[PDB]
Scaffold this active site. Structure first.
Site, PDB file in Angstrom:
ATOM      1  N   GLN A  11      75.097 -22.943 -50.061  1.00 58.65           N
ATOM      2  CA  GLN A  11      76.093 -23.533 -49.174  1.00 58.65           C
ATOM      3  C   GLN A  11      76.280 -25.016 -49.457  1.00 58.65           C
ATOM      4  O   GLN A  11      77.412 -25.494 -49.569  1.00 58.65           O
ATOM      5  CB  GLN A  11      75.699 -23.305 -47.716  1.00 58.65           C
ATOM      6  CG  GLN A  11      76.821 -23.579 -46.731  1.00 58.65           C
ATOM      7  CD  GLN A  11      76.318 -23.818 -45.325  1.00 58.65           C
ATOM      8  OE1 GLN A  11      76.527 -24.884 -44.755  1.00 58.65           O
ATOM      9  NE2 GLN A  11      75.650 -22.821 -44.760  1.00 58.65           N
ATOM     10  N   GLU A  62      75.841 -15.352 -49.329  1.00 60.10           N
ATOM     11  CA  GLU A  62      76.434 -15.240 -48.000  1.00 60.10           C
ATOM     12  C   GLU A  62      77.928 -15.523 -48.100  1.00 60.10           C
ATOM     13  O   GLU A  62      78.314 -16.603 -48.569  1.00 60.10           O
ATOM     14  CB  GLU A  62      75.734 -16.205 -47.048  1.00 60.10           C
ATOM     15  CG  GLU A  62      76.070 -16.035 -45.573  1.00 60.10           C
ATOM     16  CD  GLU A  62      77.339 -16.734 -45.149  1.00 60.10           C
ATOM     17  OE1 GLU A  62      77.700 -17.759 -45.764  1.00 60.10           O
ATOM     18  OE2 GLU A  62      77.964 -16.261 -44.183  1.00 60.10           O
ATOM     19  N   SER A 131      71.229 -27.334 -52.959  1.00 62.49           N
ATOM     20  CA  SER A 131      70.369 -27.862 -51.907  1.00 62.49           C
ATOM     21  C   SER A 131      69.036 -27.132 -51.954  1.00 62.49           C
ATOM     22  O   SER A 131      68.992 -25.896 -51.925  1.00 62.49           O
ATOM     23  CB  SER A 131      71.031 -27.704 -50.547  1.00 62.49           C
ATOM     24  OG  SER A 131      70.926 -26.373 -50.077  1.00 62.49           O
ATOM     25  N   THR A 136      68.550 -18.954 -50.947  1.00 61.83           N
ATOM     26  CA  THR A 136      69.406 -18.591 -52.070  1.00 61.83           C
ATOM     27  C   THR A 136      69.609 -19.757 -53.026  1.00 61.83           C
ATOM     28  O   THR A 136      69.527 -19.568 -54.240  1.00 61.83           O
ATOM     29  CB  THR A 136      70.754 -18.056 -51.577  1.00 61.83           C
ATOM     30  OG1 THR A 136      71.588 -17.753 -52.703  1.00 61.83           O
ATOM     31  CG2 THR A 136      71.462 -19.058 -50.683  1.00 61.83           C
ATOM     32  N   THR A 170      66.270 -29.840 -41.038  1.00 64.57           N
ATOM     33  CA  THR A 170      67.070 -28.835 -40.345  1.00 64.57           C
ATOM     34  C   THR A 170      66.330 -27.515 -40.192  1.00 64.57           C
ATOM     35  O   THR A 170      66.478 -26.855 -39.160  1.00 64.57           O
ATOM     36  CB  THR A 170      68.389 -28.618 -41.090  1.00 64.57           C
ATOM     37  OG1 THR A 170      69.075 -29.870 -41.215  1.00 64.57           O
ATOM     38  CG2 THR A 170      69.277 -27.643 -40.341  1.00 64.57           C
ATOM     39  N   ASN A 219      79.267 -35.869 -49.029  1.00 64.77           N
ATOM     40  CA  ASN A 219      79.679 -35.201 -50.254  1.00 64.77           C
ATOM     41  C   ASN A 219      80.700 -36.020 -51.028  1.00 64.77           C
ATOM     42  O   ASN A 219      80.737 -35.955 -52.260  1.00 64.77           O
ATOM     43  CB  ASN A 219      80.232 -33.818 -49.923  1.00 64.77           C
ATOM     44  CG  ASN A 219      79.235 -32.958 -49.182  1.00 64.77           C
ATOM     45  OD1 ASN A 219      78.074 -32.851 -49.575  1.00 64.77           O
ATOM     46  ND2 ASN A 219      79.680 -32.345 -48.095  1.00 64.77           N
ATOM     47  N   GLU A 245      72.833 -38.888 -74.779  1.00 63.56           N
ATOM     48  CA  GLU A 245      72.151 -40.173 -74.907  1.00 63.56           C
ATOM     49  C   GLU A 245      71.458 -40.582 -73.618  1.00 63.56           C
ATOM     50  O   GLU A 245      71.593 -41.722 -73.167  1.00 63.56           O
ATOM     51  CB  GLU A 245      73.140 -41.247 -75.345  1.00 63.56           C
ATOM     52  CG  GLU A 245      73.736 -41.029 -76.727  1.00 63.56           C
ATOM     53  CD  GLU A 245      74.768 -42.083 -77.088  1.00 63.56           C
ATOM     54  OE1 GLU A 245      75.442 -41.933 -78.128  1.00 63.56           O
ATOM     55  OE2 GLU A 245      74.903 -43.069 -76.330  1.00 63.56           O
TER      56      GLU A 245
HETATM   57  N1  GTP Z   1      73.956 -33.254 -48.583  1.00 59.64           N
HETATM   58  C1  GTP Z   1      74.199 -32.074 -48.024  1.00 59.64           C
HETATM   59  N2  GTP Z   1      73.157 -31.221 -47.736  1.00 59.64           N
HETATM   60  C2  GTP Z   1      73.394 -30.017 -47.162  1.00 59.64           C
HETATM   61  C3  GTP Z   1      74.688 -29.629 -46.867  1.00 59.64           C
HETATM   62  N3  GTP Z   1      74.641 -28.403 -46.313  1.00 59.64           N
HETATM   63  C4  GTP Z   1      73.350 -28.003 -46.256  1.00 59.64           C
HETATM   64  N4  GTP Z   1      72.562 -28.996 -46.770  1.00 59.64           N
HETATM   65  C5  GTP Z   1      71.096 -28.967 -46.907  1.00 59.64           C
HETATM   66  O1  GTP Z   1      70.677 -27.685 -47.329  1.00 59.64           O
HETATM   67  C6  GTP Z   1      69.459 -27.326 -46.705  1.00 59.64           C
HETATM   68  C7  GTP Z   1      69.381 -25.820 -46.487  1.00 59.64           C
HETATM   69  O2  GTP Z   1      70.004 -25.128 -47.543  1.00 59.64           O
HETATM   70  P1  GTP Z   1      71.541 -24.676 -47.407  1.00 59.64           P
HETATM   71  O3  GTP Z   1      72.356 -25.213 -48.560  1.00 59.64           O
HETATM   72  O4  GTP Z   1      72.103 -25.157 -46.093  1.00 59.64           O
HETATM   73  O5  GTP Z   1      71.517 -23.071 -47.426  1.00 59.64           O
HETATM   74  P2  GTP Z   1      71.350 -22.283 -48.813  1.00 59.64           P
HETATM   75  O6  GTP Z   1      70.977 -23.234 -49.926  1.00 59.64           O
HETATM   76  O7  GTP Z   1      72.631 -21.563 -49.130  1.00 59.64           O
HETATM   77  O8  GTP Z   1      70.164 -21.225 -48.558  1.00 59.64           O
HETATM   78  P3  GTP Z   1      70.329 -20.047 -47.473  1.00 59.64           P
HETATM   79  O9  GTP Z   1      69.833 -20.550 -46.144  1.00 59.64           O
HETATM   80  O10 GTP Z   1      69.504 -18.862 -47.901  1.00 59.64           O
HETATM   81  O11 GTP Z   1      71.779 -19.641 -47.350  1.00 59.64           O
HETATM   82  C8  GTP Z   1      69.431 -28.088 -45.395  1.00 59.64           C
HETATM   83  O12 GTP Z   1      68.141 -28.601 -45.161  1.00 59.64           O
HETATM   84  C9  GTP Z   1      70.421 -29.221 -45.565  1.00 59.64           C
HETATM   85  O13 GTP Z   1      69.746 -30.455 -45.587  1.00 59.64           O
HETATM   86  C10 GTP Z   1      75.744 -30.482 -47.156  1.00 59.64           C
HETATM   87  O14 GTP Z   1      76.894 -30.149 -46.896  1.00 59.64           O
HETATM   88  N5  GTP Z   1      75.497 -31.707 -47.736  1.00 59.64           N
HETATM   89 MG    MG Z   2      73.567 -20.058 -46.653  1.00 62.60          MG
END
Ligand code: GTP
Ligand code: MG
Ligand code: GTP
Ligand code: GDP
Ligand code: GDP
Ligand code: MG
EC number: 3.6.5.-
Lengths: 430, 86, 430, 430, 430
Positions: A11, A62, A131, A136, A170, A219, A245
């Protein structure tokens, strides 16, 4: 004849990919429909007549985010069958996305990667966004990196991972999968850039003067950093830098490739034009510890090598006159075995502004990628968080029941201990 | 633009090739050129009698050095400060 | 007759050539379309030195352009006078070196160099009487400092009796743009001493100092540094293309400026240089030229020439002037500075006069002096090299492509031996 | 032949030279562009005395301009005839002295003087037959009175047999513009007596008195004082540049006007000087010139010449006139004023005739007389010095840069000894 | 190549900095936006294309004034990140701004000072403005001066402090922090100028005929004085004066550097042109005791040295003729050990008028900086005010609880007693 492929998984990865892909389309004049109303070739491909197709692939198990993408204004841009989507989410479980549901999806992604790579002739390397604190994201990123490292070999891969903040979090289980993913990408990724959210929140609050930021504001700054990094491949410049490089200039040893970034200037249009934004003041602001893009203190450690990019109307002599001033200061000290540590790049194209965004239009900007010894603190605190719950084996049953072995947690701990010992061993003077 | 120098005058010949950028120097210098004459024209004069200290013959003007092609533009320019400290 | 071919490599060398050929074409009145539009008869008599003749009456330079990436040559073609270069002479790879000397000298540079050597052999076998080759490249980059120096050895192996020139830009520690500069500088200096008949070091720091202090222009750019280097380059071979009182080809300078075969590293300077606002104040006379010629700040290197003693010196006057004045001034500049001239070789200044001045100037001087003060550059380069090498920093990049640390040790030892034996003659007395 | 070079230092000296060179150029018909446009043949025969020859037929003065701050030379260049000066001869520092003698003679003036001595040596070694040097500087300023006097000693140490001139402006107590004038006046007079072959004192108060009383112009400015000083300066060397009945170079005046080596402080005056409204009334005759020449108010110093007795006197007549009249008038001016002429040296007036008058005038006279009345200036300077020194006022500024009070005591004692031994001969009788 | 940096701290400092920065921008033709529609270099810097940036920094802990600055018409002029602002005010407590909240801000100010200084090449010195009777102003001024005295050393610093009036006061606790700040800057500042408000109120009332003045009218006069002091660095003049040429002329001893200023003429356009404003009458008005810019009577003490600046069409002879008249008067007497006490400067540029202001346009003006023995009265009365409340230890708890020690008050009292004894010891005749 120079190309690069960006991979977006999870995500957070998809939400930062959207952010970078408005910016690239805006910077190259391409409308959201993909139609123009020779620099595009780095990120895009020509279809023969009309539209351009991004060299990007979106991954997620998802379906909500992909469905949101496929109905927005950018529905016509991306190829319909490179937005690979699953049915069941990993639900923050690393073992799920590495052993259970990610394996059945990874083959389609690898087929798409091959189909995109056969089109490119001068492939510079891969970019990946994920992230780390999610199931995932971390799991599929690990699996994709492991497959690519053997399918292609020596091609360079760059990882823009977002580690969790020191205290702000989170989830409740993100240290486990963060440590496991660090284990996985330690021996598999050539460059890793730190991107935790708390530092960027502080940057927005202090400079942009926004008291209620959302993820889009973060972002957009990340997208600007990516554009500054890759500008040298698609615009004319007095001092060019290529992706290949880097390991010759920022990576002293194969194990040490985690570095933290910074950007300057960051200022709003309401008070930007009242000050001259000289190169000296922006290059001073870029080295300020409070403007680090990751919540780490550079005053707590030595520097190893600094690679820093300029763009706009900057003149090299002014850059040298400012590097000298930084070498003069007593609060910034480099490691003993590195007499010169600066790599400088100069580009002519000024940064582009996104309408309705936060940043204003300026003629000069600086982006630094700096490798420093102080990064070990984030590893130490993540390790301390991990040990507290691993002492009582909490939340382990959610991982053992998804096919992962019991001993897999210990060896990641041993590799982190090895990395921390290596960082201490390197930083001592001879 | 990597191989074209920042300004029209290459250091070896310190000279210009015609176009606007080259033209600005062949233009700004005409302006800048004029400004220099006035203080130097002025500095010796406010102090000076105008008449030689011993002979007393009427002094000569400093107008001869500047070329007459730009002779008139210098004309009005000197007067603007003439009125200011008139 | 007695003509030379031009070979350039790397981005820095290509940018130097892009101005050198413009200067030569403007000197000979050749339009950017290859059509002669000159005024004087002498402009065509010796045009075979640098230009070839083709059907339709147009002229084409005998230059060979090589790089490991296509961007720089794809950019130089769109610049002014970019159409003169023959498209067949453009040779490039698809990968690049990434500022890694090993990649540009062992793995990638070895396979590509056959094609460029083919066209080099085509150019040399054809020409009326060969005088030699001149090489422009930078020691701060990987592909340049590797492929150029290996090409030097390959050319020397096939033409042992011809003369070889190299204009080499060495990385100064003041203005550093690459962190791995000491490694590929030290590796390149090892090979360069064994094969080059003449070497001329040029430093960006000295060029910035000159531009800021003598010309006093506000914003220096690479175009000004390139223009100064191009004027200095053209000044050396002027009397070989024009009549004069005492003609002196490159071989005559080689005889008179190199006492021992391993001491062939010169530093140069060009006079006159005056600001735009002071070009009317100054009067061009032989004393005015010779006082600026021996000025320490006028040297194209940061090396301080009053920190050592000249082994020999050379001057190439341009324009129509009396020889008696030149000789008496050369004697006077040697009687008033007897402390800075070595005493066991009397009359160690060579002079030459060419009756054709540069376009726009009535008198000009090119200075080429072999001095013992050049040791300081190798000292600081070796100091940085040994500061970085003792920890084996960035060594894995080089060692992963078949190179070992033994070649680093031998290079360091040979460079230190060169430094020592170059100063051995400074303390020598009769 | 027998030419001299010009060296000036400080702001006052630079302003004096800026009019001296204008007067010389107007006398020789040299345009501000360096092109000769004169009328008479004699205007070019002896132009080598002050002007050098360069290519293109233009002439350049052999003047050397030095100051510790760049403002004055950056201003004199924009004035009329400012382009004649060679840009290479301009030497300056970035700090200044702040009217502090110690800074301009020990700390800052010592390091800079090497560069100016280099160009001084270049100028003197080259010239056909050296006659000597002439120096213009002010004793009321720090950088001037320090660097000029140290340069005097350095020049004297290398050319002990050449002649040395100094035109020195001493601070009068009437028109005082600096509070620390006595200190650097007393310190400078100490060094000036030991090395200068000739010294000519000039006072601003006497120049204002002359301008107000003889010329009767309403508003004197520095341009008029500079013009009078320049006319007096030119009058001394006129017969060395033009034919005449009795040529008399500077060395001949040195022989005839200095009885003892330490008595070489003269006061001068120029005739005729008439107002604009009375320039038609007067008739130029030798009696009219000689009556104004010995007039007390006509002296360029406030010292009253009828308060003492002349040791010797000199006159340099200009224009075509009978010698019998000159000799009889000189005898008459010495018979009617026997009380003011010392009696143990008979026939103590020297005369010379030059057939070329100044441009615009038919007759002119320059007067140089060595008189005992000059003691009053040193008396008042020492009086102010001892009034200020007894309280150690402003002493810390000087003592903070390596100087001590012992050098003040020695300077005061030597100056008082000079005052005493200069008047010793006033009371001497045969 | 001559520069100066001005420091503004506190509300009064910022409000007088605004006043001087309208005047400088108006005098150099720069619009409020910073764009012109070679004299600017003293106060400004060129950005390469277009706008100019002042060499000034604004400091305050209380954000209201800075926020007012950043929204006015001058929002585009100043660099956005040199207007350092705090969050919490010191609230008239000296111990707060020296020990509690000023320490966390002083580092940013020092970083800005370094970043501004590295740009200058000919730095003459620093200027600082601060109202003494406030917490943040006095405390931060003391801390900045103490840091600068050791970071840079011998560079000159000038302080335009505003001491409280004899009887008129806005606070109730200002003697305490005034005495402490005088202690701090006694051994740390090279020049201190007196600026109390009551004298300037009387000047406005008597001359400008304004019965209801505000702070802006006072600040405009102060700005005019600053412009008159610094005119000699950026305009051509017959008799120049530099900043470094002060401690050699106005400061007899290292401890004594407090002097009081005056300005003339001060007159409105309604009656200015009815009188001729000769130099004699303006130089008489400047020495009138009622026109002192600080409420002190010069008739109660001796003079030590007078440095007084002219600007306009003034001729030096008229200046001398007026200095003589002042020396004649019996009501003005100088100290015994100073025979001449005047330093005179003459500049050509007339003072510039600000539209909508009080002063009219005139061709002649005079600004005097005079050091006199009568200044001890303000120290004596401030000491008497301090002792009254320090006898009962009133308001001390507000200072002891902010980290300051109990004994710190006594040593400031001892230093003031030492200064008063020194002023008495100097003024006695020998
Ligand atoms: N910088 C930034 N971090 C994000 C954002 N959305 C989620 N995160 C970070 O991602 C972490 C959790 O992973 P997610 O990307 O939300 O979810 P995922 O990677 O798809 O993993 P799943 O929960 O299995 O779906 C959280 O602790 C957030 O700090 C975003 O839009 N910008
Ligand atoms: Mg997700
Ligand atoms: N001449 C002049 N003096 C001022 C001005 N404003 C304030 N002052 C003086 O400053 C003194 C108090 O210090 P301020 O500058 O007002 O406040 P501060 O220096 O910022 O210190 P804080 O109270 O802690 O904020 C008062 O006694 C005033 O006399 C001004 O605009 N002009
Ligand atoms: N004079 C000049 N020097 C340049 C220019 N571009 C780059 N350089 C210098 O070249 C060095 C980098 O060399 P590089 O481009 O990596 O060489 P390459 O590896 O062969 O492509 C820098 O330190 C610059 O100082 C130019 O246009 N002119
Ligand atoms: N005749 C003349 N005297 C000048 C001029 N300018 C300054 N002075 C004198 O020089 C003295 C100050 O000398 P100063 O400028 O400090 O010398 P510096 O320290 O070497 O720069 C003053 O007393 C003036 O009388 C000028 O233009 N003409
Ligand atoms: Mg306040």
């Amino acid at each position: 004849m120079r190309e690069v492929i960006s991979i977006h998984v999870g995500q957070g990865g998809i939400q930062v990919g959207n952010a970078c892909w408005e910016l690239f389309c805006l910077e190259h004049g391409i409308q959201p429909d993909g139609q123009m109303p020779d620099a595009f070739n780095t990120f895009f491909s020509e279809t023969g007549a009309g539209k351009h197709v991004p060299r990007a692939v979106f991954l997620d198990l998802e379906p909500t985010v992909i469905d949101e993408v496929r109905t927005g204004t950018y529905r016509q841009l991306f190829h319909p069958e490179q937005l690979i989507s699953g049915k069941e989410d990993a639900a923050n479980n690393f073992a799920r996305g590495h052993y259970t549901i990610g394996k059945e999806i990874v083959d389609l992604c690898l087929d798409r990667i091959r189909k995109l790579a056969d089109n490119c002739t001068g492939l510079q390397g891969f970019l990946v966004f994920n992230s780390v604190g999610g199931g995932t994201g971390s799991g599929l990123g690990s699996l994709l990196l492991e497959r690519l490292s053997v399918d292609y070999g020596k091609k360079s891969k760059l990882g823009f991972t977002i580690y969790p903040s020191p205290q702000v979090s989170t989830a409740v289980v993100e240290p486990y999968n963060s440590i496991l993913s660090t284990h996985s990408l330690l021996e598999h990724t050539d460059v890793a850039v730190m991107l935790d959210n708390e530092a960027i929140y502080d940057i927005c609050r202090r400079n942009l003067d926004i008291e209620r930021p959302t993820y889009t504001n973060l972002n957009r700054l990340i997208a600007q950093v990516i554009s500054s990094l890759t500008a040298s491949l698609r615009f004319d410049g007095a001092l060019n830098v290529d992706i290949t490089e880097f390991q010759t200039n920022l990576v002293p040893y194969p194990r040490i490739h985690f570095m933290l970034s910074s950007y300057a200037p960051i200022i709003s249009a309401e008070k930007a034009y009242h000050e001259q934004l000289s190169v000296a003041e922006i290059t001073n602001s870029a080295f300020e510890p409070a403007n680090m893009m990751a919540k780490c203190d550079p005053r707590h450690g030595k520097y190893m090598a600094c690679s820093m990019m300029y763009r706009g109307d900057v003149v090299p002599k002014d850059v040298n006159a400012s590097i000298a001033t930084i070498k003069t200061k007593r609060t910034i000290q480099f490691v003993d075995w590195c007499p010169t540590g600066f790599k400088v790049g100069i580009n002519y194209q000024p940064p582009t502004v996104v309408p309705g965004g936060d940043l204003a239009k300026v003629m000069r900007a600086v982006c630094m990628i700096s490798n420093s010894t102080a990064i070990a603190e984030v590893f130490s605190r993540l390790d301390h968080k991990f040990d507290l719950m691993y002492a009582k084996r909490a939340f382990v049953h959610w991982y053992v029941g998804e096919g992962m072995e019991e001993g897999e947690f210990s060896e990641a701990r041993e590799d982190l201990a090895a990395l921390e010992k290596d960082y201490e061993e390197v930083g001592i003077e001879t | 633009k990597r191989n074209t120098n920042g300004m029209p005058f290459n250091p070896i010949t310190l000279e210009y090739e015609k176009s606007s950028a080259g033209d600005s120097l062949k233009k700004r210098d005409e302006m800048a050129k004029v400004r220099g004459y006035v203080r130097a024209e002025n500095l010796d004069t406010r102090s000076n009698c105008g008449y030689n200290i011993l002979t007393g013959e009427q002094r000569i003007g400093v107008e001869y050095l500047v070329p007459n092609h730009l002779r008139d533009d210098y004309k009005t320019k000197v007067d603007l400060k003439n009125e200011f400290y008139s | 007759m007695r003509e030379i071919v031009h070979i350039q490599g790397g981005q820095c060398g290509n940018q130097i050539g892009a101005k050198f050929w413009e200067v030569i074409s403007d000197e000979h009145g050749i339009d950017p379309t290859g059509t002669y539009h000159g005024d004087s008869d002498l402009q065509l008599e010796r045009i075979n030195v640098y230009y070839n003749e083709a059907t339709g009456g147009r002229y084409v330079p005998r230059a060979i352009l090589m790089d490991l990436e296509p961007g720089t040559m794809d950019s130089v073609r769109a610049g002014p006078f970019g159409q003169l270069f023959r498209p067949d002479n453009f040779v490039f790879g698809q990968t690049g070196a990434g500022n890694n000397w090993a990649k540009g000298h062992y793995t990638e540079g070895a396979e590509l160099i056959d094609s460029v050597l083919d066209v080099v052999r085509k150019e040399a076998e054809g020409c009326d009487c060969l005088q030699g080759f001149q090489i422009t490249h930078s020691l701060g980059g990987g592909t340049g400092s590797g492929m150029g120096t290996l090409l030097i050895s390959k050319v020397r192996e096939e033409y042992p009796d011809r003369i070889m020139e190299t204009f080499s830009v060495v990385p100064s520690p003041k203005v550093s743009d690459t962190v791995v500069e000491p490694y590929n500088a030290t590796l390149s200096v090892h090979q360069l001493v064994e094969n080059a008949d003449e070497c001329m070091v040029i430093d960006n720091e000295a060029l910035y100092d000159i531009c800021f202090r003598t010309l006093k222009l506000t914003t220096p750019t690479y175009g000004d540094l390139n223009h100064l280097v191009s004027a200095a380059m053209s000044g050396v071979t002027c009397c070989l293309r024009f009549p004069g009182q005492l003609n002196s080809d490159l071989r005559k300078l080689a005889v008179n400026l190199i006492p021992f075969p391993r001491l062939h590293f010169f530093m140069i300077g060009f006079a006159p240089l005056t600001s735009r606002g002071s070009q009317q104040y100054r009067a061009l006379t032989v004393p005015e030229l010779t006082q600026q010629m021996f000025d320490a700040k006028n040297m194209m290197c940061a090396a301080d020439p009053r920190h050592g003693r000249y082994l020999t010196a050379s001057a190439l006057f341009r324009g129509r002037m009396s020889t008696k004045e030149v000789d008496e001034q050369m004697l006077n500049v040697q009687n008033k500075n007897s402390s800075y001239f070595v005493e066991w070789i009397p009359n160690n200044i060579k002079s030459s006069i060419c009756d054709i001045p540069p376009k726009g100037l009535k008198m000009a001087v090119t200075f080429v002096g072999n001095s013992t003060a050049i040791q300081e550059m190798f000292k600081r380069v070796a100091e940085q090299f040994t500061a970085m090498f003792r920890r084996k920093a960035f060594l894995h990049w080089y060692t992963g492509e078949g190179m070992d640390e033994m070649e680093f040790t031998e290079a360091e030892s040979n460079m230190n031996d060169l430094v020592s034996e170059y100063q051995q003659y400074q303390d020598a007395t009769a």
